[PDB]
Amino acid sequence: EYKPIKKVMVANRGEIAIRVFRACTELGIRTVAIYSEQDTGQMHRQKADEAYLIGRGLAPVQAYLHIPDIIKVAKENNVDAVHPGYGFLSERADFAQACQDAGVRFIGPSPEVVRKMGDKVEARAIAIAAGVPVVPGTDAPITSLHEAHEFSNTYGFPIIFKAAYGGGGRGMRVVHSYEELEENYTRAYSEALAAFGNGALFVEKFIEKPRHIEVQILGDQYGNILHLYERDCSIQRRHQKVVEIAPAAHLDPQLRTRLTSDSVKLAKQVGYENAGTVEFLVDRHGKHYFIEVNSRLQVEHTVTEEITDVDLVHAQIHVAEGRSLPDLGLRQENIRINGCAIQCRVTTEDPARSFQPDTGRIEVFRSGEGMGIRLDNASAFQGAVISPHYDSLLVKVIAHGKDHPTAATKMSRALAEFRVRG
Amino acid sequence: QENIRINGCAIQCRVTTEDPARSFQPDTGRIEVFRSGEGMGIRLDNASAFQGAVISPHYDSLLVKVIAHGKDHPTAATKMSRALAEFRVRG
Amino acid sequence: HGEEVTPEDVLSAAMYPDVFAHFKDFTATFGPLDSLNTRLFLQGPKIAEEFEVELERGKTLHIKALAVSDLNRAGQRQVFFELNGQLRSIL
Numbered sequence: 001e002y003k004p005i006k007k008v009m010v011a012n013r014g015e016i017a018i019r020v021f022r023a024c025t026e027l028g029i030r031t032v033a034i035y036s037e038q039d040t041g042q043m044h045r046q047k048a049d050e051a052y053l054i055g056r057g058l059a060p061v062q063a064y065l066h067i068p069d070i071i072k073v074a075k076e077n078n079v080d081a082v083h084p085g086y087g088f089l090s091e092r093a094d095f096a097q098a099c100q101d102a103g104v105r106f107i108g109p110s111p112e113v114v115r116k117m118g119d120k121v122e123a124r125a126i127a128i129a130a131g132v133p134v135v136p137g138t139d140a141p142i143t144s145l146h147e148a149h150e151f152s153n154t155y156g157f158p159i160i161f162k163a164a165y166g167g168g169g170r171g172m173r174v175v176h177s178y179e180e181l182e183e184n185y186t187r188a189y190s191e192a193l194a195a196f197g198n199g200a201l202f203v204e205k206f207i208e209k210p211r212h213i214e215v216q217i218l219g220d221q222y223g224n225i226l227h228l229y230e231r232d233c234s235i236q237r238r239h240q241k242v243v244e245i246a247p248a249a250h251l252d253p254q255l256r257t258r259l260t261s262d263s264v265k266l267a268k269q270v271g272y273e274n275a276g277t278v279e280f281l282v283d284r285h286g287k288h289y290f291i292e293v294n295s296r297l298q299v300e301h302t303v304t305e306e307i308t309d310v311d312l313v314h315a316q317i318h319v320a321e322g323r324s325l326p327d328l329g330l331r332q333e334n335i336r337i338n339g340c341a342i343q344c345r346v347t348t349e350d351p352a353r354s355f356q357p358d359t360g361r362i363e364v365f366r367s368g369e370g371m372g373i374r375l376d377n378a379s380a381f382q383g384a385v386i387s388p389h390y391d392s393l394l395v396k397v398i399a400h401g402k403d404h405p406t407a408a409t410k411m412s413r414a415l416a417e418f419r420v421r422g
Numbered sequence: 423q424e425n426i427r428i429n430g431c432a433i434q435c436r437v438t439t440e441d442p443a444r445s446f447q448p449d450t451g452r453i454e455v456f457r458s459g460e461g462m463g464i465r466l467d468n469a470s471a472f473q474g475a476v477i478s479p480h481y482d483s484l485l486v487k488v489i490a491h492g493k494d495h496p497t498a499a500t501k502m503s504r505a506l507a508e509f510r511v512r513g
Numbered sequence: 514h515g516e517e518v519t520p521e522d523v524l525s526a527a528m529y530p531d532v533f534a535h536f537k538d539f540t541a542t543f544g545p546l547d548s549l550n551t552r553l554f555l556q557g558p559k560i561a562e563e564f565e566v567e568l569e570r571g572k573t574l575h576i577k578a579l580a581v582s583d584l585n586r587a588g589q590r591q592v593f594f595e596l597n598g599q600l601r602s603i604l
């Protein structure tokens with residue numbers, strides 16, 4: 001109903017750019033692409049209609065983080081909408097505020113919601129405000145061994161330190177005794193103060209057999225919030241996602257509906273109005289403990305996208321247009337379960353030494369197309385050279401079938417069909 | 423019977439080395455570039471299409487079979503439009 | 514040989530028709546010129562060297578020349594070019 005979008009520009013690289021270009025071409029919207037000098041041999045450059053260079057004299061990883069160049073290139077090319085992707089400016093409210101001040105549309109939540117998210121304190125307070133139980137532990141950041149000692153004495157003996165200033169694993173070590181406790185705390189504090197910024201640490205209860213379930217949330221500006229479905233990704237080598245399964249493995253209907261209701265209530269209370277992810281945690285006895293809320297679109301969205309046969313990028317574009325959810329004809333009672341899907345990622349890590357990423361030149365490449373097999377090629381082609389400056393993703397593969405063993409067997413055949421030499 | 427149910431719509435197309443201009447006459451030669459266009463609900467079956475392939479003048483002239491599954495007829499029609507636009511077979 | 518001829522070309526043809534026809538025939542085959550470097554247009558791409566050609570405001574591309582084959586049977590050579598990330602063979 002509002003000002004239609006005539007041009008969309010994106011600030012990521014690899015598979016997200018390709019996906020959004022397909023989405024825009026489906027709606028007949030002109031595409032604008034950006035790239036760095038050290039990254040001039042990809043495919044998304046020739047896929048779009050026009051391409052421009054950024055970060056001419058910057059670092060290869062820092063070239064995509066320079067806001068003013070993106071702002072001016074968007075201003076000069078009459079760009080109306082910009083997509084943030086994930087992993088590049090998506091979780092920094094400064095870019096969103098600058099885009100809003102520049103008169104360009106931003107595909108995503110308001111800067112206020114982003115600022116509310118991010119740091120764990122505000123999200124944790126909002127969680128305890130209404131339902132959605134969180135893991136027991138300290139509230140304020142802990143920097144003293146004494147208060148850590150009382151916190152360990154009160155709750156339980158096995159504890160793990162969780163740090164701030166970065167969502168990565170960093171120094172996640174678990175304390176099981178007393179003698180190692182002091183030395184581990186001192187080492188973690190030294191690493192936080194030296195290798196990182198704020199030495200904010202928190203003491204909590206490490207779950208012996210964790211199981212985390214994700215839920216997607218889609219919102220509009222008319223105060224309508226719809227949950228897509230749940231996700232399980234318990235396969236973690238250390239703390240990173242490896243293999244994704246689309247539906248719940250074995251969840252009680254009461255558990256799944258209660259989790260859905262809690263996620264919807266949290267989204268409504270925060271008033272989220274775009275596509276985001278809500279992360280929880282399930283114990284063997286069963287206790288949904290809040291972890292965090294992702295304000296961007298996750299890379300593992302394709303499983304839910306395939307189960308419900310709903311295109312999320314089209315939904316995001318149309319909701320950024322202004323059209324309400326009923327206009328799109330998307331209703332919570334209009335979606336249903338259809339089959340199962342398994343998601344896997346092709347990396348260039350040596351699977352023997354330490355999962356250490358490898359570098360080289362691809363000599364032989366063939367791909368496997370199957371029945372419920374869908375492929376997303378990032379930079380895989382004949383005579384390609386992979387750079388160590390960025391991540392090491394070749395192909396994102398999704399396998400869909402009527403049953404979990406069926407999808408597993410189909411994916412096994414598909415990977416057996418893949419042929420990468422060099 | 424009860425376990426079979428309709429779910430969505432589908433469109434099927436085949437690419438062929440024939441000239442739609444004069445008489446739908448088949449053409450022979452060597453391909454110099456080939457690219458794929460697989461997407462969200464796009465299924466592709468490649469018979470013989472690779473860089474530097476040679477098309478025999480006496481056998482079948484089928485290269486690729488493309489299929490779209492979508493929620494509605496216009497949706498799948500648009501997916502075929504975009505996928506066929508993405509494909510590039512020159513020479 | 515007219516598909517989008519403008520009045521400017523109409524007036525140019527009345528000036529020198531023969532060279533206009535020759536120029537149009539040459540441009541149709543080898544493609545759009547005056548996007549190349551002058552030394553590139555006169556001398557050509559030296560082997561094992563990569564250069565850049567600018568086409569439109571965003572359409573920008575790179576070429577690297579690899580090697581040249583020998584005469585096969587009919588006085589024909591094969592040349593291997595390396596585009597942005599791919600390999601093409603021309604005769």
Ligand SMILES: Nc1ncnc2c1ncn2[C@@H]1O[C@H](COP(=O)(O)OP(=O)(O)NP(=O)(O)O)[C@@H](O)[C@H]1O
Nearest residue numbers: 160162167168169172204205206207208210239240
């Ligand atoms: N059983 C557990 N008990 C307490 N904390 C845990 C437990 N398991 C995992 N955590 C934390 O869960 C986190 C998962 O790691 P990681 O996936 O890298 O964070 P993340 O979700 O990506 N954060 P972000 O980047 O903001 O999205 C690690 O810090 C783990 O230490």
